């Protein structure tokens, strides 16, 4: 996987993350773990690979920093469907209970911070998994607006931050994550394998509204996947397969013309579109949701 192995980078990250409890994912050799402890951090190591645990546990006995090491793969917590039957893969409810982490309301301040690096070849998969957890307020997000800082490769970073201003890279996860979080680059590291961006993902206090909730976000995801399935088409073309309501009237309410294209819609335009349909009255039904669309 990806590991912080450069001492100078580790010292830089420690100042970023300190300047509250820290969950470090896949510390590996523990160069960042040691830098965090030297800097005075309180760290819980979630290490997926057992072979690194002896040295990590050696670090906590001898350094002036309370360290707890758990054999836990953060990216396998609370499988979206499955039986929780894997030693390294666990439930966040059981982990957070053992760690004494208490849930707080969505509106409250950040209870906890998670830091690490996305897997080099599972970035989209991980972003989808976290997005489902976030919008549903399950897994770690059952406990509040968890701050997540993750290194990501440049290609997926540029796609995540794209919008109508850069249409060629604009896709479903761009909308999902820009609505969910204010995303900021905390560091950029040039590695032999390509540029890595450390992005800070703090869930927005105002993500959820009267009409976008943890109970109906899946309909919103369906709208987005449907639209970006034919990204060059008009929004009205897609709406005719999404809602029985008058698609032209809907678009007018959000200030868009009939010929508006999917790729010209900003993330907030999609949110207002979804809320506008949800708002409508005297309707036996607002959506034609009858199919499961793949995560792309
Ligand atoms: Cl229509
Ligand atoms: Cl409905």
Swiss-Prot record:
The chain holds residues 72 to 396 of 396 of the full protein. Changing residue 231 to A: Impairs transcription initiation. Residues 230-231 are annotated as: DNA-binding. GO terms for biological process: mitochondrial transcription; rRNA methylation; transcription initiation at mitochondrial promoter. Ubiquitously expressed. This is Dimethyladenosine transferase 2, mitochondrial. S-adenosyl-L-methionine-dependent rRNA methyltransferase which may methylate two specific adjacent adenosines in the loop of a conserved hairpin near the 3'-end of 12S mitochondrial rRNA. Component of the mitochondrial transcription initiation complex, composed at least of TFB2M, TFAM and POLRMT that is required for basal transcription of mitochondrial DNA. In this complex, TFAM recruits POLRMT to a specific promoter whereas TFB2M induces structural changes in POLRMT to enable promoter opening and trapping of the DNA non-template strand. It is found in: Mitochondrion. It comes from Homo sapiens. S-adenosyl-L-methionine binds at residues 4, 47, 73. Its EC number is 2.1.1.-. Induction: By the nuclear respiratory factors NRF1 and NRF2/GABPB2 and PGC-1 coactivators. Homodimer. Component of the mitochondrial transcription initiation complex, composed at least of TFB2M, TFAM and POLRMT. In this complex TFAM recruits POLRMT to the promoter whereas TFB2M induces structural changes in POLRMT to enable promoter opening and trapping of the DNA non-template strand. Interacts with mitochondrial RNA polymerase POLRMT. Interacts with TFAM. It catalyses: adenosine in rRNA + S-adenosyl-L-methionine = N(6)-methyladenosine in rRNA + S-adenosyl-L-homocysteine + H(+). GO terms for molecular function: mitochondrial transcription factor activity; RNA binding; rRNA (adenine-N6,N6-)-dimethyltransferase activity; rRNA (adenine-N6-)-methyltransferase activity. Keywords: Methyltransferase, Mitochondrion, RNA-binding, rRNA processing, S-adenosyl-L-methionine, Transcription, Transcription regulation, Transferase, Transit peptide. The keyword Mitochondrion applies. Disulfide bonds: none annotated. Belongs to the class I-like SAM-binding methyltransferase superfamily. rRNA adenine N(6)-methyltransferase family. KsgA subfamily. Changing residue 28 to A: Abolishes methyltransferase activity. GO terms for cellular component: mitochondrial matrix; mitochondrial nucleoid; mitochondrion.
